[PDB]
């Protein structure tokens, strides 16, 4: 029935289907390094007639130091990004400083929680890996769900084939990870999740923060990841 | 396809042409206690029978008061009857404040019957299932009554659901009340209606039959707890 009604088991229905609706969406990888947080993506290819060179709809920008990698309904994702950009700017307008991500996910999971509680509207079939840098506790990487129960992490692989890709980060991840070593680490889990051995490079997109006291937050071009893809060939950080 | 589709909604109409949800309210007033009023030439008496639910309980009130010359007697559910009493009280009192003359009787019931109408077309609010009985006197003593659907009938005698058929038949052959100008014969004639229409082998009137009179030099004087059992509740 509607989202307002419960179930005899204690769970819900609309928020339970949304948790499964994101399982049929492309994967995204999160990863905290010793230099800055990095993200992964999977451009689902409906055809070869997309631009494939200027845009990508799996990783967006929230602020100059906060960025998320969305995974789920691409249509409903644009609303929360248009809603998180306001909270990331209304905090600046009210406190003259950057907003900590710990105070951003709370501000954004409440907008999801408010939908699965009243109004009689459908929930948000979206879940994303939102990370950033802050002066209070350094780099961080949070993860929201359609219910709102956010939680901090070090590496997450939501989308399709989560349990397999998350297991890769259980062993291959290390506490100390450089920026270049972290990219190669996140490159293999992004490729083996799609049951392939090498990315076609006209696929997956990556992003990285690495605050150099100014939070550069550079994204990646189709030519910049070629050098990263070539480094995977020689040094294979295999499935295992 | 019939008998269960056109039954629970105040909006749908039956294919025959009857609003069956409102029609249940007209029958909902029949489960209440009886009441009867007599319109004489210059006086109006209302006899109401209360209902003692238990031996330890007290009989709940039936006959109410609205103004000095206006008093109603509900017959149905106490939930909606109390709401219409407050609406009729705030309406008539506002007329004595906004202006100085008393409120016209038919111009008052037109506002009360309109209250039923407003709670009939909206899907949310249901209909007031209560049979009102407005007895008043302004220049000629008139007796009005409503139903769940908006209605007015300048009745001369009535009954309300308990043993109404046994009481309507008594009033059909008793049309000499207009010339029974003596108040004593009127209250005995009105109480005789309940005595000949009470339940089988029940207590006649053991101080549990509310009585009220209103007339020319009479305001809504509730019959005291002593004037009725001395001779009125002792003639039969």
């Amino acid at each position: 029935s509607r989202t307002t009604t419960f179930s005899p088991e204690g769970r819900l229905y609309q928020v339970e289907y949304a948790l499964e609706a994101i399982n049929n969406a492309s994967i995204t990888i999160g990863l905290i390094t010793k230099d800055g947080v990095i993200l992964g993506a999977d451009k689902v290819f409906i055809s070869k007639l997309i631009d494939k060179a200027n845009n990508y709809e799996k990783i967006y920008k929230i602020d100059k130091h906060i960025f998320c990698g969305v995974a789920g309904l691409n249509a409903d994702a644009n609303i929360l990004i248009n809603q998180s950009r306001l909270y990331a700017q209304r905090y600046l307008y009210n406190y003259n400083e950057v907003q900590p991500v710990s105070q951003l996910v709370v501000q954004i999971c409440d907008i999801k929680q408010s939908y699965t509680q009243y109004g009689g509207l459908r929930p948000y079939g979206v879940s994303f890996l939102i990370g950033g840098y802050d002066t209070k506790d350094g780099y961080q990487l949070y993860h929201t769900d359609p219910s709102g129960n956010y939680s901090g992490w070090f590496a997450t692989a939501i989308g399709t084939n989560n349990l397999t890709a998350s297991s890769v980060l259980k062993q291959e991840w290390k506490n100390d990870m450089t920026l270049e070593e972290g990219l190669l680490l996140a490159l293999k889990t992004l490729a083996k999740s799609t049951d392939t051995e090498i990315p076609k490079s006209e696929k997956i997109e990556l992003a990285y923060l690495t605050n150099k006291d100014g939070e550069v937050y550079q994204k990646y071009l189709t030519e910049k990841e070629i050098e990263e893809l070539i480094k995977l060939y020689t040094q294979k950080y295999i499935k295992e | 396809m019939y008998r269960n589709l056109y039954d629970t909604d105040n909006i749908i109409y039956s294919p025959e042409g009857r609003l069956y949800q409102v029609e249940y309210a007209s029958e909902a007033i029949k489960q209440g206690t009886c009441a009867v009023a007599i319109k004489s030439k210059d006086y109006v008496v209302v006899s109401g029978l209360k209902k003692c639910i238990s031996k330890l309980s007290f009989p709940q009130e039936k006959i109410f008061k609205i103004d000095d010359y206006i008093g109603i007697s509900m017959s149905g559910i106490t939930s909606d009857a109390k709401v219409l009493t407050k609406f009729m009280q705030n309406e008539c009192l506002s007329h004595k404040f906004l202006y100085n003359e008393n409120i016209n009787i038919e111009s008052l019931v037109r506002s009360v019957a309109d209250k039923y109408q407003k709670n009939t077309q909206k899907s949310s609010k249901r209909a007031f299932g209560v049979g009102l009985m407005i007895a008043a006197y302004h220049n000629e003593p008139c007796i009005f009554e409503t139903r769940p659907n908006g209605s007015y009938f300048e009745y001369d005698a009535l009954s309300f659901g308990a043993r109404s058929h046994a009481s309507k038949t008594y009033l059909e052959k008793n049309l000499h009340l207009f010339e029974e100008c003596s108040l004593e014969e009127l209250i005995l004639h009105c109480l005789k209606a309940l005595k000949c229409s009470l339940s089988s082998e029940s207590e006649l009137t053991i101080s549990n039959t509310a009585l009220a009179v209103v007339g020319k030099n009479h305001p809504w004087q509730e019959i005291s707890s002593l004037q009725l059992e001395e001779y009125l509740s002792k003639v039969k």
Partner: protein, 227 residues
């Protein structure tokens, strides 16, 4: 079977959503109140089965004001909402008019809030006080019927206490006369012993016109008279 709507009628002239709550009030703790010529005495149980409770935070006899005390039954979470509303309007009445509110004027407003047409409040009360014209005791229902009672009982065991009061109520009974009577009906319908903790009587005397909760010390001298 007509149960979808909240305001639907019946072909026999009856309500449906209100009648569902009529059986919900028969599951709470039992209570009994007696209206005597000198005042009003109330009584109730205290289901504090788990000894870890504080035993004072859970109460069955709250107060509408200093002159009107009442009982509770049914949904305890909804009973507090009506009592909180009664504590507002009765106190709001004292701010407008300097005299204390009448129970006939207070029970009529506690019943109009059970006419939300949400859902009807599944709670029955035993509002009693000594406002004016001596002491009065009223018993409300979720349907809105406000019947003034001389001695009634509400709770899961209200059926047994009903016939007991009919064979025991006398009009010329004082406070100490009914105080033992307010416990003999509780001694019958009780799955425990009438100790000094399970009973929580309180009364409103006509002299001081205020209510006073009978503490643990005062009830011990009344539960040991053995009716």
């Amino acid at each position: 079977e007509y149960d979808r709507g909240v305001n639907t009628f019946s072909p026999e002239g009856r309500l449906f959503q209100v009648e569902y709550a009529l059986g919900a009030i028969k599951l709470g703790s039992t209570a009994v109140g007696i209206c005597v010529n000198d005042g009003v005495i109330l009584a109730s149980e205290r289901r504090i089965s788990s000894t870890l409770i504080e035993k004072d935070s859970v109460e069955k006899l709250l107060s509408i004001d200093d002159h009107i005390g009442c009982a509770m039954s049914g949904l305890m979470a909804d009973a507090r909402t009506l009592i909180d509303y009664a504590r507002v309007e009765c106190n709001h009445y004292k701010f407008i008019y300097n005299e204390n509110i009448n129970i006939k004027s207070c029970v009529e407003l506690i019943s109009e809030l059970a006419l939300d047409f949400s859902r009807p409040f599944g709670v029955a009360l035993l509002i009693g006080g000594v406002d004016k014209n001596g002491p009065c005791l009223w018993y409300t229902e979720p349907s809105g019927t406000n019947t003034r009672f001389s001695a009634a009982s509400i709770g899961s065991a209200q059926e047994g206490a009903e016939l007991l009061l009919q064979e025991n109520y006398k009009k010329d009974m004082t406070f100490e006369q009914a105080e033992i009577l307010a416990l003999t009906v509780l001694r019958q319908v009780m799955e425990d012993k009438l100790s000094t903790s399970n009973v929580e009587i309180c009364a409103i005397k006509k002299s001081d016109q205020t209510f006073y909760k009978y503490n643990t010390d005062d009830i011990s001298r009344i539960i040991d008279v053995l009716p």
